[PDB]
Amino acid sequence: NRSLIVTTILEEPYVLFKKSDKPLYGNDRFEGYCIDLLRELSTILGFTYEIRLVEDGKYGAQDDVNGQWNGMVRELIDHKADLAVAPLAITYVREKVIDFSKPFMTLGISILYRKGTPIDSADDLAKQTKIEYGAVEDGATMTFFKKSKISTYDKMWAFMSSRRQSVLVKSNEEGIQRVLTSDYAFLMESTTIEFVTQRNCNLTQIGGLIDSKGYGVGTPMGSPYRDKITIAILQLQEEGKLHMMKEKWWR
Amino acid sequence: SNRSLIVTTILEEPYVLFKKSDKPLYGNDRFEGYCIDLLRELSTILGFTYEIRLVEDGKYGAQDDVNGQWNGMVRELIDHKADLAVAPLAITYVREKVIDFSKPFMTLGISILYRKGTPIDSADDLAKQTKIEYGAVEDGATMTFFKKSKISTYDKMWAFMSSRRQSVLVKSNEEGIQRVLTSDYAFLMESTTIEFVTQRNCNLTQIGGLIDSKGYGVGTPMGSPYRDKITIAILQLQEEGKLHMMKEKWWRGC
Ligand SMILES: N[C@@H](CCC(=O)O)C(=O)O
Ligand SMILES: N[C@@H](CCC(=O)O)C(=O)O
Ligand SMILES: [Cl-]
Ligand code: NA
Ligand code: NA
Ligand code: NA
Ligand code: NA
């Protein structure tokens, strides 16, 4: 049968290009937690697949003036991919336009910053401007702030929007480099913060989780794969395989 | 007017309780708790009315391996005796094959409730011994996790629990807690409930970490159009901070 087109995005340790001396081709180019997930789903559900990086390099958000989506979400809306297998947050706004499996990992927004300071919460960032802060452009964290009616978060959005050419970044990698190289705190998902802090010992999580969400496999709205992938994820969780995969990649 | 939805649930503090009062209470007004607040919010978002009914057999739901039949809230949904189950109903592999669930409103895992002051640190330490008995709620998700597991520690635990089932499998969390308090017994329990119980009984503690990871969701019959609508409403309530407020209200030490 037809191979499924799987959209994804580079994001350590979920999706990476493998290091090698010989050039690599096709699906053999990729590794990571989400790549191992995809391999397991493919075996359980009996499909073949072709991995393609999302061409615009975005997770996906809606344009406020023209209403169009971008990123992996737009690829699914337009039926240019069958699945999105990535650290793709299940959110209110996205679930209205695409379908998601139940989550394979749970997480929340938190803060990445340097050690040694009195900053302990988002509220502490919101009430000042000397320490700048920001988020990945056109992802779920940005959209959370953009939509929030909560005073603290609304104040933070006004700051990030004002300063967006500087403080909104195109990747978590760029956000980390800003924390390391300037007085900047990065609003980041907690799973990714756990990976970064285990490797950058001068960095830490500030405060707790601001919210709660899961990562799910995206599908176009109405896809029959959505419920089949949910059941496969639940099987992998119960057998311990997801925990083993997390340990492997967060080591 | 549209037909009221029948909502099956089960008593379990602090998710669903009977309100304390002097005058008798009637109908939906009898109930309070996190899940009751959740139901009220869903009803307003989606625009339905409802009638709360306690599951007749008092069970969450498991399948009989001899006759293949389900019981509990799961069976009430399969049979269309209820439109929704709004309860601390775990989303599990075996259940998602027969009923539908919303995406989770809370995440949790199985862990161990025991008395303080012990060298027992994990499920492995319990599994290797038989002086301290252990068990779970009959016909719920924790029992079914053990019954199905291929992992050596957990399969060994299941063999023990199955052998001693008439004594160590209980009908409710409340009964399990009483057994921990009155005998040398450790109870396999969901972590959100452990947190509630240990906040209020300072002689008790969680032992070890989470054995697994799962969510609670609203159950519906398979194919129900309410499933996706309730998912969207849950996501809205989470993002607005209302689920967090509800958890703080119902879990609000030792
Ligand atoms: N995982 C996010 C991107 C990173 C972020 O927004 O922090 C998403 O699905 O949009
Ligand atoms: N919440 C469980 C019942 C309690 C338990 O199994 O620990 C269920 O949905 O079956
Ligand atoms: Cl779902
Ligand atoms: Na959807
Ligand atoms: Na009960
Ligand atoms: Na009374
Ligand atoms: Na289902």
Swiss-Prot record, chain A:
Annotated positions binding L-glutamate: 87, 89, 94, 140-141, 189
Effect of residue 202 to Q: Loss of glycosylation
Glycosylated residues, chain numbering: 1, 202
Coiled coil: none
Modification after translation, per record: Sumoylation mediates kainate receptor-mediated endocytosis and regulates synaptic transmission. Sumoylation is enhanced by PIAS3 and desumoylated by SENP1. Ubiquitinated. Ubiquitination regulates the GRIK2 levels at the synapse by leading kainate receptor degradation through proteasome.
Subunit structure: Homotetramer and heterotetramer with GRIK5. Tetramers may be formed by the dimerization of dimers. Assembles into a kainate-gated homomeric channel that does not bind AMPA. Can form functional heteromeric receptors with GRIK4 and GRIK5. Can form functional heteromeric receptors with GRIK3. Interacts with DLG4. Interacts with NETO2. Interacts (via C-terminus) with KLHL17 (via kelch repeats); the interaction targets GRIK2 for degradation via ubiquitin-proteasome pathway.
Similarity comment text for this entry: Belongs to the glutamate-gated ion channel (TC 1.A.10.1) family. GRIK2 subfamily.
Name this polypeptide is given: Glutamate receptor ionotropic, kainate 2
Organism, as annotated: Rattus norvegicus
Gene: Grik2
